[PDB]
Amino acid sequence: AMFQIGKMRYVSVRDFKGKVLIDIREYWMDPEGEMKPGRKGISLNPEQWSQLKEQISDIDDAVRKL
Amino acid sequence: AMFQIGKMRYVSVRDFKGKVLIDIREYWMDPEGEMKPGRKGISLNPEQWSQLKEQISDIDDAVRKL
């Protein structure tokens, strides 16, 4: 699965080894026609996924404080 | 502005030159005792940040579907 959160920024979500590969990274175009991640990005650990969502309320609040 | 979202992974919402950036990066402890931001991570702006939260309804579905 490939979601999008911004221009040239897609979220890679697929089966990998023995876990769900959730990688949020910039997506560049392949010479052929596909798209793949670059360098700027971070993978969302299954455990981090929950913590991040829960911290969103505080994170978002900090954004409005700046 | 330092929100822990996992182990060695912290979301830092800092204003950079007049731009509130939600930098989701890793932090490794130096020999001194301070956590320094690693090279692996991504700086999301409020715009992409909003989309990320909105895309959760889609991403979470793929994560909850093992």
């Binding site: 990998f16 993978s43 | 996992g6």
Partner: peptide
């Protein structure tokens, strides 16, 4: 495929780093 496969082999690089560390404890 040129970049597709290239930016795939390096997926496990962060998989065994970011996608594998929170389940280590807590």
């Amino acid at each position: 495929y040129g970049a597709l496969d290239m930016a795939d082999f390096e997926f496990e690089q962060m998989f065994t780093d970011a996608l594998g560390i929170d389940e280590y404890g807590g």
